[PDB]
PDB file of N, CA and C in Angstrom:
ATOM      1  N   UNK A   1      13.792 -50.912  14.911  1.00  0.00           N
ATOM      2  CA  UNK A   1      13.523 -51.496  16.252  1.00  0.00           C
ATOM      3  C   UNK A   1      12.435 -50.717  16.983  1.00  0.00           C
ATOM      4  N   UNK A   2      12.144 -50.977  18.419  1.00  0.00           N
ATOM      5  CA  UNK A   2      10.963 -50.495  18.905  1.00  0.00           C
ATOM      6  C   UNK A   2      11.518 -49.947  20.169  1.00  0.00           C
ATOM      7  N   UNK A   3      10.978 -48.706  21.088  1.00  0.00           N
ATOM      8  CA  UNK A   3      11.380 -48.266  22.093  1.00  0.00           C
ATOM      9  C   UNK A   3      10.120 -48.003  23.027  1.00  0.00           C
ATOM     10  N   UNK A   4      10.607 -48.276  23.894  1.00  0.00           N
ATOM     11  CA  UNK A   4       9.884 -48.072  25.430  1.00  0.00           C
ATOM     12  C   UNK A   4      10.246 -46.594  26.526  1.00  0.00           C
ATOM     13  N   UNK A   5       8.941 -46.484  26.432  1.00  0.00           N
ATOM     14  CA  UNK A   5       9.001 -45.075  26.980  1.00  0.00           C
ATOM     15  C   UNK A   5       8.390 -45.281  28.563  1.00  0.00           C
ATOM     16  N   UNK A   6       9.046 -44.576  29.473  1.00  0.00           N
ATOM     17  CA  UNK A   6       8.211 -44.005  31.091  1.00  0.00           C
ATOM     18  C   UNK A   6       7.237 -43.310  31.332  1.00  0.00           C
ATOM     19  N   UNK A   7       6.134 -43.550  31.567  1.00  0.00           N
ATOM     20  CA  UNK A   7       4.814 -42.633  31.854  1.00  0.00           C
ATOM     21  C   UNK A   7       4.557 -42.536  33.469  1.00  0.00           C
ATOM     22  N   UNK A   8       3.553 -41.305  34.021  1.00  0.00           N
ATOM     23  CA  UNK A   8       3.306 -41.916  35.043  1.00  0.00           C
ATOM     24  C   UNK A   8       1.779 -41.025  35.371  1.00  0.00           C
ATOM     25  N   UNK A   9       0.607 -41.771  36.201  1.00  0.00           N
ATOM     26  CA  UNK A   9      -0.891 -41.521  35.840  1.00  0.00           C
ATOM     27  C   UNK A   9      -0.111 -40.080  36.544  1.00  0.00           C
ATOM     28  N   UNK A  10      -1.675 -38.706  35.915  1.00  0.00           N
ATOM     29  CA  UNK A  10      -1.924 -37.699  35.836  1.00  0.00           C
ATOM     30  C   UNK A  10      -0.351 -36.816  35.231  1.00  0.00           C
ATOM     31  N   UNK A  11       0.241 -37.255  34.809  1.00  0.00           N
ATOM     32  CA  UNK A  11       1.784 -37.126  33.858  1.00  0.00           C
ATOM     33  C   UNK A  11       1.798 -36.974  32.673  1.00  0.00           C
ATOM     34  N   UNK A  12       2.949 -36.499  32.042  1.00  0.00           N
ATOM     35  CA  UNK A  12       2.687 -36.648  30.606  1.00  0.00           C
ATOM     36  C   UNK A  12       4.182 -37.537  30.084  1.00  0.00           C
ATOM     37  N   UNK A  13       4.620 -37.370  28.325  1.00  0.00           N
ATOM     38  CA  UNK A  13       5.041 -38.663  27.649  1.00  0.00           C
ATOM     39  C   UNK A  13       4.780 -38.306  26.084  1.00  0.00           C
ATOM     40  N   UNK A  14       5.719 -38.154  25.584  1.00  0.00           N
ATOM     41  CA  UNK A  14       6.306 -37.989  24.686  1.00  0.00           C
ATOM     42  C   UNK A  14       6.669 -39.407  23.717  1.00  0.00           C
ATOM     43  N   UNK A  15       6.462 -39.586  22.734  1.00  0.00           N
ATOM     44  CA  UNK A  15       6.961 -40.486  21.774  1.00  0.00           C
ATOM     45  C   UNK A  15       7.978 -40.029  20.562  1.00  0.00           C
ATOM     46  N   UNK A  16       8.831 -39.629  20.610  1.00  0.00           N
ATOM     47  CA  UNK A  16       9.920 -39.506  19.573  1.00  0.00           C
ATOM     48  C   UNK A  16      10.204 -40.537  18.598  1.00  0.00           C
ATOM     49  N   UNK A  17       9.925 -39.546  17.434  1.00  0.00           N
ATOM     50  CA  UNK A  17       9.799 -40.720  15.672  1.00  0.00           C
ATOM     51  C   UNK A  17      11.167 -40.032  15.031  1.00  0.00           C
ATOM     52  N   UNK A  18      12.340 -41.038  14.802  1.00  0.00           N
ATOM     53  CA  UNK A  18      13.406 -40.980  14.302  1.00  0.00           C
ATOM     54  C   UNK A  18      13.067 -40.392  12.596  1.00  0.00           C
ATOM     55  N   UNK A  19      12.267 -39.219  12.176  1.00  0.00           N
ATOM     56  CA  UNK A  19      12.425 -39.288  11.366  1.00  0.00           C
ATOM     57  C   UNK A  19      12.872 -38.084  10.648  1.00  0.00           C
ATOM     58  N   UNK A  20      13.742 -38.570   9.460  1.00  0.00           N
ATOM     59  CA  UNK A  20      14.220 -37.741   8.982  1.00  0.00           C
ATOM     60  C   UNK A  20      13.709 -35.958   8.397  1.00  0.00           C
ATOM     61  N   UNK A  21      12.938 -36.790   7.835  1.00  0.00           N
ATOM     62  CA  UNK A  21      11.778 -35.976   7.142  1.00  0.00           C
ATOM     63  C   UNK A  21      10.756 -35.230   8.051  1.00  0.00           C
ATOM     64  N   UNK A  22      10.517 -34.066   8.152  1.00  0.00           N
ATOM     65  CA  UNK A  22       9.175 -33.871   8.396  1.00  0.00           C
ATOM     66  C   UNK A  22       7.786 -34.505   8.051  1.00  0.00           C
ATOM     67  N   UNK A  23       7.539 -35.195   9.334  1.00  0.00           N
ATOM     68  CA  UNK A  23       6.167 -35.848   9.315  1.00  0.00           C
ATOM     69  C   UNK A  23       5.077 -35.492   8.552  1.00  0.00           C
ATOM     70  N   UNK A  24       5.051 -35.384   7.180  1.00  0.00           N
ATOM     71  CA  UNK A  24       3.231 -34.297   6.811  1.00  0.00           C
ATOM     72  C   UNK A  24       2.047 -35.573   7.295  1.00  0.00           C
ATOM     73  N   UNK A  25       2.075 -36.618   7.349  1.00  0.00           N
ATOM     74  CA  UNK A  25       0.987 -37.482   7.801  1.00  0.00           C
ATOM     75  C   UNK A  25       1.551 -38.811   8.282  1.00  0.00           C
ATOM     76  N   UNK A  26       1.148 -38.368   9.804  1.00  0.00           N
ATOM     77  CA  UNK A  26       1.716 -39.625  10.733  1.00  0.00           C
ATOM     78  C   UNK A  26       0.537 -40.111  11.177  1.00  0.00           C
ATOM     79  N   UNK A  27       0.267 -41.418  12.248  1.00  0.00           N
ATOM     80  CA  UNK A  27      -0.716 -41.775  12.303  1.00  0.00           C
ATOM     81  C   UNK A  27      -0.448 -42.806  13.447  1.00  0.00           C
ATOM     82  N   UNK A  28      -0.998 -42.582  14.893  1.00  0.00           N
ATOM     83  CA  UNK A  28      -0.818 -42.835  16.098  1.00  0.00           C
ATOM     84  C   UNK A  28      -1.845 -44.338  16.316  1.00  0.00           C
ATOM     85  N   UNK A  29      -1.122 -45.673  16.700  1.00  0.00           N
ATOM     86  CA  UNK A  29      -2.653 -46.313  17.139  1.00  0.00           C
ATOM     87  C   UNK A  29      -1.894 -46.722  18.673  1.00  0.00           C
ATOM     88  N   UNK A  30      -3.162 -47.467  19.249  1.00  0.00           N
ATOM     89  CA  UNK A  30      -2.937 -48.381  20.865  1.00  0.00           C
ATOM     90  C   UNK A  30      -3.468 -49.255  20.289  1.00  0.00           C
ATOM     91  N   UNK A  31      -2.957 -50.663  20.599  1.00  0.00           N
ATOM     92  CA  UNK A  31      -3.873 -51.979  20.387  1.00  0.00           C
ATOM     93  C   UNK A  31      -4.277 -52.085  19.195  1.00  0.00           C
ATOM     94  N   UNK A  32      -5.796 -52.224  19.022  1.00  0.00           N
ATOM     95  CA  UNK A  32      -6.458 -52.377  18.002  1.00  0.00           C
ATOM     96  C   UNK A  32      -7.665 -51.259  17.941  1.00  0.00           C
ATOM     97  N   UNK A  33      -6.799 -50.118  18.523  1.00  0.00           N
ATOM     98  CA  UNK A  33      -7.673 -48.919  18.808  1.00  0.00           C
ATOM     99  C   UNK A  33      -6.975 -47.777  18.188  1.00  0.00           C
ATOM    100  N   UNK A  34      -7.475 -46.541  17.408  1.00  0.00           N
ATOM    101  CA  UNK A  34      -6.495 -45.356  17.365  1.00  0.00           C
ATOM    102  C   UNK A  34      -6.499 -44.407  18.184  1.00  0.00           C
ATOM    103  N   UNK A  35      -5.082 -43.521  18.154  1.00  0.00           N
ATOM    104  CA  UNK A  35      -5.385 -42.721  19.265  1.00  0.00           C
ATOM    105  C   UNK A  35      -4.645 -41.073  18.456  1.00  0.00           C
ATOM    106  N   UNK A  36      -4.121 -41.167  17.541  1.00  0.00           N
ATOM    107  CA  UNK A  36      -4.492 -39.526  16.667  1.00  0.00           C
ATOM    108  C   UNK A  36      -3.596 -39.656  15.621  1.00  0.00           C
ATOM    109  N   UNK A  37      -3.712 -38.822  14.346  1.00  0.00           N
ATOM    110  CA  UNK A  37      -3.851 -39.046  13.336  1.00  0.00           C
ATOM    111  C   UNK A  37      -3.326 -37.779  12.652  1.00  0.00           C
ATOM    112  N   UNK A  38      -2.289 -37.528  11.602  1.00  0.00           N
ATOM    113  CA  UNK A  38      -1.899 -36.232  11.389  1.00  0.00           C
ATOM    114  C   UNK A  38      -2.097 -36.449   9.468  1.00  0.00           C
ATOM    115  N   UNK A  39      -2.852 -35.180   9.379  1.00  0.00           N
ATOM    116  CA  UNK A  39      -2.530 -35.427   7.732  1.00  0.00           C
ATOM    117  C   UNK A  39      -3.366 -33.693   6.924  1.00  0.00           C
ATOM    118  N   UNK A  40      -2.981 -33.746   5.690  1.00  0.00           N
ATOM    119  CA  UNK A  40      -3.284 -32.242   5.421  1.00  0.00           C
ATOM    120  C   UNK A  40      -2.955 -31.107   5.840  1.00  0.00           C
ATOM    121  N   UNK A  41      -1.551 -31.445   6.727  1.00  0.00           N
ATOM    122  CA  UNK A  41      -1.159 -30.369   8.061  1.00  0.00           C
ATOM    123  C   UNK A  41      -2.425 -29.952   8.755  1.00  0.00           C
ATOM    124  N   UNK A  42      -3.418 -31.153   9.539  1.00  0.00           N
ATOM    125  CA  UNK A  42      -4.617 -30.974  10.019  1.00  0.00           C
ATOM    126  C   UNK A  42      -4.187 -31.950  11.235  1.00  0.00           C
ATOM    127  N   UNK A  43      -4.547 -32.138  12.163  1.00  0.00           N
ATOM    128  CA  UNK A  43      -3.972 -32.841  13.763  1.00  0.00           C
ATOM    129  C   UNK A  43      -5.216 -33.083  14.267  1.00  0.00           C
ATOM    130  N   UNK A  44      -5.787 -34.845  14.224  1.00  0.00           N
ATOM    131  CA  UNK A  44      -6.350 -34.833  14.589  1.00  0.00           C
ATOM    132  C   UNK A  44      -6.481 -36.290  15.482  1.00  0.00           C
ATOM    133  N   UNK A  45      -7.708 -36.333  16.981  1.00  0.00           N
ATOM    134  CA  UNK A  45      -6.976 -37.917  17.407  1.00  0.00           C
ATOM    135  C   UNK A  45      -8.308 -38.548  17.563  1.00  0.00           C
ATOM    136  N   UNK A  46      -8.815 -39.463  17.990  1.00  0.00           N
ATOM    137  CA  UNK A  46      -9.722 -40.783  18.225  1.00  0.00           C
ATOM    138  C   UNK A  46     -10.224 -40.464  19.074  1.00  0.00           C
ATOM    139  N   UNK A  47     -11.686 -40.937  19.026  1.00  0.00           N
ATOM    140  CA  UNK A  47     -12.365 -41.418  21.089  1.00  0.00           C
ATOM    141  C   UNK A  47     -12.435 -40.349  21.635  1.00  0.00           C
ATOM    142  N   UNK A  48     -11.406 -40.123  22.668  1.00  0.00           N
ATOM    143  CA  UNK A  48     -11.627 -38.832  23.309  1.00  0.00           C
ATOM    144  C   UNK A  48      -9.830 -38.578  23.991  1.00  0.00           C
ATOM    145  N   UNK A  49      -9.029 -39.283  22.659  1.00  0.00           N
ATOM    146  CA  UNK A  49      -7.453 -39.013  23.432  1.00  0.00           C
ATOM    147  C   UNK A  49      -7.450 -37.329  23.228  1.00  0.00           C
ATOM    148  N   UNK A  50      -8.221 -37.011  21.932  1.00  0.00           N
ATOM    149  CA  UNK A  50      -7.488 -35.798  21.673  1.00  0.00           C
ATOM    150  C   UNK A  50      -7.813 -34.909  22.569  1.00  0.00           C
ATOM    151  N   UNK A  51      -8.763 -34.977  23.488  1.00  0.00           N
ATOM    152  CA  UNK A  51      -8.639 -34.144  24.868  1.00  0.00           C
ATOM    153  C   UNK A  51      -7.838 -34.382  25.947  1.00  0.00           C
ATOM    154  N   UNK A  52      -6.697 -35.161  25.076  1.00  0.00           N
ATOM    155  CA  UNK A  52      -5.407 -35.724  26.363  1.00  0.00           C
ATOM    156  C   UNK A  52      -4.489 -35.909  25.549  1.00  0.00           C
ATOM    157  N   UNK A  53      -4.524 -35.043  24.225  1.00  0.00           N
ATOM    158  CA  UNK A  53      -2.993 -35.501  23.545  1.00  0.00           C
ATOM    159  C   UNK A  53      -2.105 -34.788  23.077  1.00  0.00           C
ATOM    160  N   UNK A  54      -0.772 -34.350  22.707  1.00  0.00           N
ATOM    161  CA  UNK A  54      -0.145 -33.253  22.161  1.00  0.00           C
ATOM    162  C   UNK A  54       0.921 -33.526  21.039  1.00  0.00           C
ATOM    163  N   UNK A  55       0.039 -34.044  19.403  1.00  0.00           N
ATOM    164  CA  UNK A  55       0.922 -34.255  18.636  1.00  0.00           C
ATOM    165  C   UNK A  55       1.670 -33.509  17.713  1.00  0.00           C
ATOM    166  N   UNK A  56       2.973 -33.514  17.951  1.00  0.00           N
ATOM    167  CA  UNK A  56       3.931 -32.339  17.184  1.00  0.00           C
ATOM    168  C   UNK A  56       3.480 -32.523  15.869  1.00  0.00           C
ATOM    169  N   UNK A  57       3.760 -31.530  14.579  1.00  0.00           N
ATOM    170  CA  UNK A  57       3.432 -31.016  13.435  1.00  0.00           C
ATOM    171  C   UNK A  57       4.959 -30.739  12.945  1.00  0.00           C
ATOM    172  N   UNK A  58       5.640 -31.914  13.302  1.00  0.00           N
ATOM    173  CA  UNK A  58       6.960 -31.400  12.740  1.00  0.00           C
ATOM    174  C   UNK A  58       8.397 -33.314  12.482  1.00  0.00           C
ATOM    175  N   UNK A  59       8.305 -33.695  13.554  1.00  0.00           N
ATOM    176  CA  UNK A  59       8.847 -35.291  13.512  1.00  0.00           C
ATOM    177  C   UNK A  59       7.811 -36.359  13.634  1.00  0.00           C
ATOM    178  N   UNK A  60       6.923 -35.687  13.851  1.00  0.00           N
ATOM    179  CA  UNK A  60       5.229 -36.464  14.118  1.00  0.00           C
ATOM    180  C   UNK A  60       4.850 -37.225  15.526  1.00  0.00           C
ATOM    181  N   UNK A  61       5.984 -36.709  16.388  1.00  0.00           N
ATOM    182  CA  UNK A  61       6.218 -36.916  17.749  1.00  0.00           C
ATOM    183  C   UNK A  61       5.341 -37.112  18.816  1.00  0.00           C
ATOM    184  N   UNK A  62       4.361 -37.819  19.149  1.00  0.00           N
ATOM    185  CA  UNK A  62       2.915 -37.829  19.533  1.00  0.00           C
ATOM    186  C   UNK A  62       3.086 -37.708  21.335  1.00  0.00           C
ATOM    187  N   UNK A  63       2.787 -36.432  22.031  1.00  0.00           N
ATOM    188  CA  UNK A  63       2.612 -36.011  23.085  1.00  0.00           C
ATOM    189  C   UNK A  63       1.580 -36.465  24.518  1.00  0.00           C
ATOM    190  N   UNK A  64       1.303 -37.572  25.155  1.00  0.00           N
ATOM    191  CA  UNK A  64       0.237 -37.682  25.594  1.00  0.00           C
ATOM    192  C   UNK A  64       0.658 -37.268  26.940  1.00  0.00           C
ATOM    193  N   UNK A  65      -1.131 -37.060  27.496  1.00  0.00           N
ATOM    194  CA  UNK A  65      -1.318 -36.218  28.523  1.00  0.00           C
ATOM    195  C   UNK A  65      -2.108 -37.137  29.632  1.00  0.00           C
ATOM    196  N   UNK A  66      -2.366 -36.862  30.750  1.00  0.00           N
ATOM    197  CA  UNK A  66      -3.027 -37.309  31.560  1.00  0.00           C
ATOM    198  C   UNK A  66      -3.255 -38.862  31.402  1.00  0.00           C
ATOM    199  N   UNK A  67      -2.102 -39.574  32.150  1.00  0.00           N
ATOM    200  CA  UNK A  67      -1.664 -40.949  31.425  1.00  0.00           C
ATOM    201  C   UNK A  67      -2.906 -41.710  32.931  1.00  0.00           C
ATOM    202  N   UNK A  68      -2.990 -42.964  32.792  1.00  0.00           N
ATOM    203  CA  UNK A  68      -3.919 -43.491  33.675  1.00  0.00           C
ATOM    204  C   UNK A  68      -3.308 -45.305  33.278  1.00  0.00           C
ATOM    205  N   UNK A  69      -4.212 -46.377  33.719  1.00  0.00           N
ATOM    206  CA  UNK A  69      -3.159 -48.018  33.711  1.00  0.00           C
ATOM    207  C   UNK A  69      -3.758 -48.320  32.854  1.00  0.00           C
ATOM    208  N   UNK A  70      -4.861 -47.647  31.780  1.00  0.00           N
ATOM    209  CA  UNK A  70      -4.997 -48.248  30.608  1.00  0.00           C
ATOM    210  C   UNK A  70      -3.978 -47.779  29.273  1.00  0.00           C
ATOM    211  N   UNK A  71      -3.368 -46.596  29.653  1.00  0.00           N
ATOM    212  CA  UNK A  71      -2.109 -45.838  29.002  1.00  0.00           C
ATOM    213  C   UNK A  71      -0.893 -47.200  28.969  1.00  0.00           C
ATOM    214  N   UNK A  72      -1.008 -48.016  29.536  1.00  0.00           N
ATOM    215  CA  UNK A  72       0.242 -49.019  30.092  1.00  0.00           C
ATOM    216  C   UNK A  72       0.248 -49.795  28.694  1.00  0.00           C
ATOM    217  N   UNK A  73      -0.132 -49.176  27.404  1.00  0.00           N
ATOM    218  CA  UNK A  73       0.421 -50.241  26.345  1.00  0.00           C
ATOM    219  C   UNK A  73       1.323 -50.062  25.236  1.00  0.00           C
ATOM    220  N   UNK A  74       1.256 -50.627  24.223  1.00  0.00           N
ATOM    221  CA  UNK A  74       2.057 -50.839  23.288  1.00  0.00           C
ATOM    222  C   UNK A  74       1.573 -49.635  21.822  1.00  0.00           C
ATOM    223  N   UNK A  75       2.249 -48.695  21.687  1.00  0.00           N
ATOM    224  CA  UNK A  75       1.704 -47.736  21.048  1.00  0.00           C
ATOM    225  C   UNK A  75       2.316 -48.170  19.626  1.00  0.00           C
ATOM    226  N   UNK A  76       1.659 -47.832  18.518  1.00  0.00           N
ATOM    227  CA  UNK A  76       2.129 -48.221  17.258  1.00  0.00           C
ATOM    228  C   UNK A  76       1.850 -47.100  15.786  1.00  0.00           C
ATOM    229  N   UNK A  77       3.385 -46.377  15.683  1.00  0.00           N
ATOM    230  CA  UNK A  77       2.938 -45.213  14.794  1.00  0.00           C
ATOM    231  C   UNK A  77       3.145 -45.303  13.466  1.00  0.00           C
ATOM    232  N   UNK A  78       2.452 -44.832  12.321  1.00  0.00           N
ATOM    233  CA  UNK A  78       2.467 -44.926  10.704  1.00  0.00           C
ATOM    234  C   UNK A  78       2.802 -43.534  10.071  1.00  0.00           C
ATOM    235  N   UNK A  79       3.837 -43.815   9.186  1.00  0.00           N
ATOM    236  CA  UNK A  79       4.123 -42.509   8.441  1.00  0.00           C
ATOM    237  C   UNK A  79       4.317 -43.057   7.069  1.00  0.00           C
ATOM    238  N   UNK A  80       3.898 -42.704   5.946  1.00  0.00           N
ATOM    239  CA  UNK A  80       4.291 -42.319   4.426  1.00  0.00           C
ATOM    240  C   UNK A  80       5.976 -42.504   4.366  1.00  0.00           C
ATOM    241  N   UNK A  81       6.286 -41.231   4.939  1.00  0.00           N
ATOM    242  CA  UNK A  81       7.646 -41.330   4.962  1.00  0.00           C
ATOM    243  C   UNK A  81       8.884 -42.472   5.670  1.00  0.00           C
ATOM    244  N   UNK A  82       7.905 -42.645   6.553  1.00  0.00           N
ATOM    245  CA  UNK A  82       8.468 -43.780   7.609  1.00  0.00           C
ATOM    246  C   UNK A  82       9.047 -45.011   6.564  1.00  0.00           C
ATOM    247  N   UNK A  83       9.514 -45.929   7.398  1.00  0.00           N
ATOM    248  CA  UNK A  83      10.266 -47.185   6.610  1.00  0.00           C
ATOM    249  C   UNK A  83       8.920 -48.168   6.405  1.00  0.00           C
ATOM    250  N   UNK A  84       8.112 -48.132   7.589  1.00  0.00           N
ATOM    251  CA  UNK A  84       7.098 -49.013   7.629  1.00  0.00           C
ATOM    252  C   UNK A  84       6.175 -48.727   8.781  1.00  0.00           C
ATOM    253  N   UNK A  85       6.365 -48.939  10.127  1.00  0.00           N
ATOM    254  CA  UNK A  85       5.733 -48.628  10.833  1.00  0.00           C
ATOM    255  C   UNK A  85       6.566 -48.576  12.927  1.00  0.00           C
ATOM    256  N   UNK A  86       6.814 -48.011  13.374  1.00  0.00           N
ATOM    257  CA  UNK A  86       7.362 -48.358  14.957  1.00  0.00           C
ATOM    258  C   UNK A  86       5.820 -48.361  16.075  1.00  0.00           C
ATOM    259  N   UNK A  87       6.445 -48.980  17.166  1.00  0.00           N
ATOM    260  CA  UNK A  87       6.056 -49.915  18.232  1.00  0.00           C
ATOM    261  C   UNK A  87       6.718 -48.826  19.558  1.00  0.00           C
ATOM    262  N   UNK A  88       6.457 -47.717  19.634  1.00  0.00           N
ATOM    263  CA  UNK A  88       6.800 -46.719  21.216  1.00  0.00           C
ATOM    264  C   UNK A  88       6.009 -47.596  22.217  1.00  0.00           C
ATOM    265  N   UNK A  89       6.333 -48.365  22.937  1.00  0.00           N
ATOM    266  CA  UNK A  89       5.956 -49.113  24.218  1.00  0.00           C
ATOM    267  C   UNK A  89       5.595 -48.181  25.361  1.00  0.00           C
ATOM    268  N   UNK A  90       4.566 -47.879  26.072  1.00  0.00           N
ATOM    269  CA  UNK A  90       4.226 -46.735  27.290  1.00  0.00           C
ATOM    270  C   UNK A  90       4.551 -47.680  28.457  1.00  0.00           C
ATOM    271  N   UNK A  91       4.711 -46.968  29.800  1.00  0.00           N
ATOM    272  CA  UNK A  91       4.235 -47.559  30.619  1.00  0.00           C
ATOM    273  C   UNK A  91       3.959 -46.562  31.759  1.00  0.00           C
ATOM    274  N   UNK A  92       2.876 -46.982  32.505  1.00  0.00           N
ATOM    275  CA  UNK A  92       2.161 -46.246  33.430  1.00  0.00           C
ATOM    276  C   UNK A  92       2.941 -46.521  34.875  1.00  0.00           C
ATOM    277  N   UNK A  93       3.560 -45.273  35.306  1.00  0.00           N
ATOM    278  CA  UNK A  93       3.992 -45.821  36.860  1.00  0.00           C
ATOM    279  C   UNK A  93       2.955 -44.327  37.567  1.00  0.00           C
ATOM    280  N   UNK A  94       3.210 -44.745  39.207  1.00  0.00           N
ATOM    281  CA  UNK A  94       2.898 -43.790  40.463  1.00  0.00           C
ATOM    282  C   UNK A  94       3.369 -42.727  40.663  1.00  0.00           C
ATOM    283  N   UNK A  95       4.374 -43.108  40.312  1.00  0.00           N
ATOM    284  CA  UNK A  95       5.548 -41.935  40.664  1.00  0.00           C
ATOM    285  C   UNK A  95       7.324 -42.578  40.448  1.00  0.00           C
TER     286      UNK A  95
END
């Protein structure tokens, strides 16, 4: 299934990946855009999230930072290990 997470602009937000296994290569997108990418025990993200992102090296748990109303979407993460793929839903509030 898919879960929805609380954000809020200049805030941060956490995505928690049910997975069993240690993540060695997970793989973060938004939309039809990526936003960071783990593999080779190397951490790396897209565009310019990775100057706004904090992805764990351990459940593959993808950390974001300095959220804003384009943050307000549907996040979608990939693992090897994974079953297939999950859907962490963001959303941007004020406060």
């Amino acid at each position: 299934s898919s879960q929805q997470i609380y954000g809020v602009k200049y805030g941060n937000v956490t995505f928690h990946v049910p997975s069993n296994q240690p993540l060695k290569e997970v793989l973060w997108k938004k939309q039809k855009d990526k936003v960071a990418e783990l593999e080779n025990s190397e951490f790396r993200a897209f565009s310019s999230f990775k100057n706004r992102v904090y992805l764990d090296t351990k459940s593959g748990s993808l950390t974001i930072y300095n959220l804003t109303s384009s943050d307000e979407d549907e996040y979608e993460m990939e693992s090897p290990n994974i079953t297939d793929s999950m859907k962490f839903f963001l959303y941007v509030g004020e406060s």
